[PDB]
């Protein structure tokens, strides 16, 4: 998408669940939506699945109803390979170059890319120091009090004086 | 010494036996750390599921107790034909016909064995029923007319497990904000005119929908039913309803799940009220009528299988995996085999095909020579006619 | 020889296609009016159907008169057909493919190796145009020539369920068919269709051209759609009934989606894998001819 | 008696269960049973324990 | 109760499956009767359906609940693990005997 030349073996590096559990289907669904914002940070691969599962659980949890239905469509047609138009233009290119080539046949081109918010996803170490802005686009009206649970001294100690 | 006999000869014996007809399960993946057997069960919505594999205490004449010590003779005191030192004994390749024919004999003994029970269950497959109040919401409603409803406990006892068998999304809770259109989408998703009540109060159009479309509301209780509806007519009343039975056949209508032929319907309508002992007596009678002496191998197998107690409740039974956690999983394409999705009453395909013709015979008017009712009247019988 | 009319052979009353319905011989079109649809969130997008292979499988040296119509209809519609590619007699259509062959395709649906007395048959030219495509049923199972059995069903749905707008778009929601039904409806529909003299339909589909072919394609669209309906019920993932106030609505979900099921069921006919390969090939050829 | 499913009584790992049930399951007597049924309807004057 | 739902749920297994009959025939006969509105709880009504017996179905749900209660029961000794598995079978037997 950044326009760089890429030497990768195949235009899409995602797997297609030919036969899978429900969780694999939801993973494959959220993998074609490309929710993540670009990041240069190191990630912990060991828990990657969990992250991608949690991301999925949130993505569907607060997407607009049409995006929700789109996610559901992908989730049900897990055998189909969803992809952006430009991906398919790349496949057409490589087919016209080498007609004998075998590509996964069951594909669906997105006529329009989803407009979902990009998700920050730095799963590496370090706390975030948010600078809360005074105002934003969202308007609130009688929001319920958000109780904060007690935390252990193991997580955070509170000395009197820096 | 024995290694060549194992790796090079016995291995092929294993590879053949794995292909024998009745060796039907997957036994071991070769990885001890992770392997567990898939655990199917036969599962009645009525009775308890019966796992195919369990510690049921049947030693099978001591076969289930494993002596490991057997390895000692296999190593230190057994001969093998591959281990010659060299006589060169010729390898034996056993006739397929023997194991094949005994496998077939077993299979045919089994189908013939289950047949009468499968038949009676196919007939009574629609016969389970929930209690159903029908509140009247109009000035001139007949007792059958109104808003059908049932207790949630009935829904658990009968409707829910069958919905799990039919593999459809659970029926929507209705909150009184619900449109008749939402209700319609639910019913058309579950193929069953059922919705669960949640919070008051159901609105006018939704109630007219439930009435006109005979949707069955599932109330948690009947504590104050009329409070739950916004009855503009005020024709509804807590004391005005008709309690009545609702057959499952009158809810569900799946072709290989719940027999709902009007033939079978009227045939059941002819039946006297039935206990489980009555049904069992029927199966035993049919079996007594249609028992035929088996090939001698089959008699040996039935003798080996022990008494045919058949405690399992086979009504509407399906084959489903359970979680090791104990919950019964819905049938899943991409894991369970297609044969398992519907038991088809545990009848053969041809038997169903014939069964349809038979139903055409059984409801033929010419056969229907059992007559109901007589008119006592004192009259001269000049020129008699039977008719 | 029965000469083909200026219209198709289907214009002749001898080849009326009708399904029994409400105690009458209903035309298929007036059955399809009973059909109704419930869109799901899911979508069918029709892809281009790959061009059928040029290769006509060689007719084997077969002494006998093959009953081709029976084989084809039973493969597409038969309640009990199985292993339809093992016997391999569809290749026989290729015998009719030759110019000036001694073979005749009888109205019986049999493939006589020689013209024989008191057996009426289709005009050999039209049959040649027909066989030149449909002999390729004879390689429905050979691996190099197997049709896609997944994507093609989209077209089925489009030609069946599709509204004129959805058909122009080339995409439609995956729908779920439904109609008020008598007991054993789909089985009876399938048997009423297996009795059809569909060779008339295919012969006219392959032989006609220009205005005649177009008029054929409109006059016979509902016939084709009935065949598509039987076929789709054979591949529908499930087929439920619904109570609807002392009426029963048969419902097959879903149109245009081959579930690849091979387990039998009482409700409808079932495709074994071979029947799937055959139906896939048939739909490839027939949809190819249907668009031109 | 029909207290146990087939095989379970002779089962060695069932032994604690079988002992528990047998500890609960009193022998049938017409008198105690008829009494149990009858006292459902009979008036109570001394409170039962 | 907010945190003891399993206790309340198990307790609901004890709710009676009958109905409260009015003693009509006695009132017609002017039989002695200390209550001003004589009544009596019949333990179970006769089966109104042709196959389902509501009593037996209720016992099915009870035994199912008790079985999942036993299944969820943590046990220390191996022998307890065994009795835990056997108790479920015995429960299944009770269910058929009741039916």
From Swiss-Prot, chain D:
This is Inner capsid protein VP1. Homodecamer; each decamer is made up of two conformers of VP2, called VP2A and VP2B. 12 homodecamers assemble to form an icosahedral capsid. Belongs to the turreted BTV-fold inner capsid family. It comes from the Viruses. Inner capsid protein that self-assembles to form an icosahedral capsid with a T=2 symmetry, which consists of 120 copies of VP2, with channels at each of its five-fold vertices. This capsid constitutes the innermost concentric layer of the viral mature particle. It is found in: Virion. The chain holds residues 446 to 494 of 1333 of the full protein.
Swiss-Prot record, chain E:
Belongs to the turreted BTV-fold inner capsid family. Disulfide bonds: none annotated. Homodecamer; each decamer is made up of two conformers of VP2, called VP2A and VP2B. 12 homodecamers assemble to form an icosahedral capsid. This is Inner capsid protein VP1. It comes from the Viruses. It is found in: Virion. Coiled coil: none annotated. It comes from Bombyx mori cytoplasmic polyhedrosis virus. Inner capsid protein that self-assembles to form an icosahedral capsid with a T=2 symmetry, which consists of 120 copies of VP2, with channels at each of its five-fold vertices. This capsid constitutes the innermost concentric layer of the viral mature particle.
